[PDB]
């Protein structure tokens, strides 16, 4: 069998910063149809986060140029469309993996939340580029994925859990940027922060590291969305 | 069309999409037309980044492969990366040889680029082949050095860049650390001499700084006397 080899190669690709290869290896490993361990889920996420991150960054540059020139010819639109299409291909691939293999009405709650957060994240990336037609559905598919994830995490995981914090952080970004609900973004972020803060002495070192890093991102967004 | 491919290559540079940038520049070249100064740099920037990423990865994987057996996945994947890297170098050398040609200034530039890409093949070549590739890199650089020395000022950034890379070739590839250091100091001392002199100062000085860096890396600067502390 080559599942273990695909996973070993994905770890090598991570060290070599070959994220497209990392994503492909993890995709193939998922497709062997066995659940992923904690380590393996993170490899899947790291890989696609980086792949899509690069496409999004590029799309932003190109879209920004396209808009500021509309008072550099058809080339900007054509190339922005190429990048956009490619990006959608990645999100569709990731959502295809989540729906066909990973998300299940079964198993522990953390991994359930992890995949639904991932589902919200990738529908949110589709929403970043979508036009009014697709937009509404997509925004809503992102909202339900996050909301379902939020409901589980709130009942099953501590407020200091990094998957829970990460979920809240991203859902608040969704509110601010995508849904155009800056109030619930600010509110969710403050609430998340304060609830986690109250529970910090229950966390000992090592877990405190992971969680305070995400709490620092919440504080940063809050300061940005308001004042220092 | 050609002008569109060049416009798209500029956009790809801004979006940091170097594989796309390389492909657009390849297509623009393929259309014969000599490249302007700006266009040559776009070609170089694109492939420098593409191959840079493959080299960095190859470095990591080869390093793991060597430290480890002192596991077939490492070899297989290192081979995949290596093969892909060779494909890029072969593509670039194919462009240089196929659509090479005009003037002395630009002739240096392409021969330097020819030396650079044969040097990247040498970074991974095994034996019978490695030894030949090293010479194709050496002649490309040497021919370019001879032109630059007779036609360009010692402050010229293409000339400085060529010297810098040829000296790297000597230390790393040819295992001639003596001429690598000789060449690198000679190059920086000859440029330092005529520094005061349009105004491309900052352009040139950046490459001078790389020569001192790589020389300090190979004691540090000049002799040491008692440091007051």
Residue numbers in the entry:
A (entry chain A): 1 to 71, 77 to 233
B (entry chain B): 2 to 71, 78 to 108, 112 to 207, 210 to 230, 234 to 244
Question: What does the literature reporting this entry say, word for word?
Answer:
The 14-3-3 family of eukaryotic proteins are abundant, medium sized proteins (~30 kDa subunit mass) endowed with a well-characterized phosphopeptide-binding ability. The human 14-3-3 family comprises 7 isoforms (β, σ, ζ, γ, τ, ε, η), that form all-helical W-shaped homo- and heterodimers. More specifically, 14-3-3 s bind protein partners that have phosphorylated serine and/or threonine residues presented in a specific molecular context. To aid structure determination, we have developed a streamlined approach based on chimeric 14-3-3 proteins fused to the sequences of interacting peptides.
PKA-dependent phosphorylation and subsequent interaction of the transcription factor Gli, a central player in Hedgehog signaling, and the steroidogenic acute regulatory protein StARD1 with 14-3-3 proteins have recently been reported, however, no accurate structural information on these complexes was available. For chimeric protein construction, we have chosen the main phospho-site of Gli for pCH2 and the first potential 14-3-3 binding motif of StARD1 (RRSS57LLGS) for pCH3. The pCH2 crystal structure was determined at 3.2 Å resolution. There is one 14-3-3 dimer per asymmetric unit; forming a closed cyclic structure with its symmetry mate where a single subunit of each dimer contributes its phosphopeptide to the binding site of the closest subunit of an adjacent dimer having its own binding site occupied by a sulfate ion (sulfate was present in crystallization condition). In the inter-dimer complex, the central Ser640 is bound by the same canonical residues of AG as in pCH1 and other 14-3-3/phosphopeptide complexes. Interestingly, this binding mode leaves the two opposite AGs unoccupied by the two remaining phosphopeptides which are unresolved in electron density maps. Instead, these ‘unbound’ AGs appear to be occupied by sulfate anions present in crystallization media at high concentration. The quality of electron density maps allowed unequivocal tracing of all linker residues of the Gli-derived phosphopeptide, except for the C-terminal alanine. Interestingly, two closely packed phosphopeptide-binding 14-3-3 subunits belonging to two different dimers, form Cys38-Cys38 disulfide bridge. However, this interaction is distant to AGs of each subunit and does not appear to interfere with 14-3-3/phosphopeptide interactions.
